[PDB]
Structures are given as structure tokens and as C-alpha cells.
Design an enzyme around this catalytic site. Structure first.
Site, PDB file in Angstrom:
ATOM      1  CG  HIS A  91      36.633  30.434  43.131  1.00 40.62           C
ATOM      2  ND1 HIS A  91      37.772  30.231  43.886  1.00 40.62           N
ATOM      3  CD2 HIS A  91      36.611  31.757  42.826  1.00 40.62           C
ATOM      4  CE1 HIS A  91      38.407  31.380  44.035  1.00 40.62           C
ATOM      5  NE2 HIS A  91      37.729  32.321  43.403  1.00 40.62           N
ATOM      6  CB  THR A 195      39.245  38.909  44.641  1.00 36.51           C
ATOM      7  OG1 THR A 195      38.470  37.732  44.382  1.00 36.51           O
ATOM      8  CG2 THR A 195      40.479  38.931  43.797  1.00 36.51           C
ATOM      9  CB  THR A 196      36.460  36.613  48.857  1.00 38.73           C
ATOM     10  OG1 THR A 196      37.416  35.552  48.886  1.00 38.73           O
ATOM     11  CG2 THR A 196      35.662  36.456  47.582  1.00 38.73           C
TER      12      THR A 196
HETATM   13 ZN   LIG Z   1      38.203  34.205  43.006  1.00 40.81          ZN
END
Ligand SMILES: [Zn+2]
Length: 257
Positions: A91, A195-196
Site C-alpha cells: 500500500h 505505522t497504523t
Molecule cells: Zn504503510
């Protein structure tokens, strides 16, 4: 509930996910004055020739191109890694304008976007099992700089209109991720996190020094999806990046000087 807005964005995440203030969080700023050249770092092996893409999904915070990880096909080996990691999805993160979008920065420079190719360690049973381990995941990070178009990206940007609504997916077979890679595999590496949310500290980060060039035309197309919600006049998916977190008691190593 978490997102990227004023009231549920990155500065709020620590309430639901305390690990947001933990010791190995990502992204970070890569300061080229203090990253340490490490001669023991092996070359990276990116073996994507057998990749099998399946579909592309709007998951409400990005679009993920998902792969068949049921067997070794597209894998990451070598570099700082102790074994084989299977590609499960990639992504991007991007900005509301070209001057921002990347999660990692280099001497505080922000790129227009950042590609994450997510892999899990075949020492573990599957992705779900791997994110519970400190060496569970390897994410290959590639910066996107605006310029010439990346021809291998066009199939991705062309299909995005079909998944503007959160949760929607489209068939996406026979996409070759080799078309998203720069010439050089020179890299920085450090131990970090998703990072999420859930921000699990299960990731060996490998960030490539060389960005890929994509056109303004291409990055514009990233900005057409919506964040979860529907209407009547709701919210487009832009600035889905977490800002750089403190490096704390870690060291960023480089495969190059
Ligand atoms: Zn990412």
C-alpha cells in the site's frame, strides 16, 4: 474510531493503543548524519518473479494490493533478515499536496508518497501470528518523488476509481510488483512498528535510499478514494501518513556510506 483527522488522528492514537508511545515506533526521520554504515549488512534479495496478485482493497485508510501468500512466491530475503518473508500486500501513504505524504523522512525531507511492501516471516504460521513477534514482519519502504511516470504503477492508479468507497475491492490479478522498484537496493534499516493501529512492534524496516519517480498525474489519482464513511458529503483519503516518531534507544543502520 482512529483515523487521520484532528480528533482521531496520530496524536490521539495512544489512548486506544498505548504502544503508540513505545520504544520501537515507526516511522522515523532518517538523519543521514547519524545513520550508521554497517559493513556486516548483506545485500537485500527481492525475489518477486513468481508474485501472484489477487485484488485491491480500500480498507478505509489506504488501498492494499493483496497477494497469494499461501506458498513462497514473492519473497524478501537477505539484508538484515534471518529468513524468508512472504509478500502479503503493499500500500501507499500520500499527502493532500505533493510537498508531503511520506511517513519516513530523510534529513526531514518529505516525499509526495511512500510505498510499503509488507512481508511476514515464514518461521511463523501466518500474518496474524507473525505480528505478535518482534521479527514477524519485514516492510520494504520506497519513496515516491514526482517526476517521470512509473509505468509499472499505471495499472494500480487506473483501477482506483472502482474502490473509492471504503470496504470495496476489485479483482487485481497479474500485477507485477517488480515494476515498482528502483535500480538500487541500497537501504537503511531499523527495528520498528506498524505505522497504523495496532502499531505492533513487529517490523524490521528496510527503507530504500533511491526513490522511484511517479508523475503528478499518477499521484493525483491516489487522492480520489474516500476515508470510511459514505456521505452525504464525506471525506477523501489524503494525508494518511503518521508523522515521524522519536528514534529513542535505537540506531538506524545503513548498507552504504
Ligand atoms: Zn504503510
Amino acid at each position: 474510531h482512529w483515523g487521520y483527522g484532528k480528533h482521531n488522528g496520530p496524536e490521539h492514537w495512544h489512548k486506544d493503543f498505548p504502544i503508540a508511545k513505545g520504544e520501537r515506533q515507526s516511522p522515523v526521520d532518517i538523519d543521514t548524519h547519524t545513520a550508521k554504515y554497517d559493513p556486516s549488512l548483506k545485500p537485500l534479495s527481492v525475489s518477486y518473479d513468481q508474485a501472484t496478485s489477487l485484488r485491491i482493497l480500500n480498507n478505509g485508510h489506504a488501498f492494499n494490493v493483496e497477494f497469494d501468500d499461501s506458498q513462497d512466491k514473492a519473497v524478501l530475503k537477505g539484508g538484515p533478515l534471518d529468513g524468508t518473508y512472504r509478500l502479503i500486500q503493499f500500500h501507499f501513504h500520500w499527502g493532500s499536496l505533493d510537498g508531503q505524504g511520506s511517513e519516513h523522512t530523510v534529513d526531514k525531507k518529505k516525499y509526495a508518497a511512500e510505498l510499503h511492501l509488507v512481508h511476514w516471516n515464514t518461521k511463523y504460521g501466518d500474518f496474524g501470528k507473525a505480528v505478535q513477534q518482534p521479527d514477524g514482519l519485514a516492510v520494504l519502504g520506497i519513496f515516491l518523488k514526482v517526476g517521470s511516470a512509473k509505468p509499472g504503477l499505471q495499472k494500480v492508479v487506473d483501477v482506483l476509481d472502482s474502490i473509492k468507497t471504503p470496504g470495496k475491492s476489485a479483482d487485481f490479478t497479474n500485477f507485477d510488483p517488480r515494476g515498482l522498484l528502483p535500480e538500487s537496493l541500497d537501504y537503511w534499516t531499523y527495528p520498528g512498528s506498524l505505522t497504523t493501529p495496532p502499531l505492533l512492534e513487529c517490523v524490521t524496516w528496510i527503507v530504500l535510499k533511491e526513490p522511484i519517480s511517479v508523475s503528478s498525474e499518477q499521484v493525483l489519482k491516489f487522492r480520489k478514494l474516500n476515508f470510511n464513511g459514505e456521505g452525504e458529503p464525506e471525506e477523501l483519503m489524503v494525508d494518511n501518513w503518521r508523522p515521524a516518531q522519536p528514534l529513542k534507544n535505537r540506531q538506524i543502520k545503513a548498507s552504504f556510506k
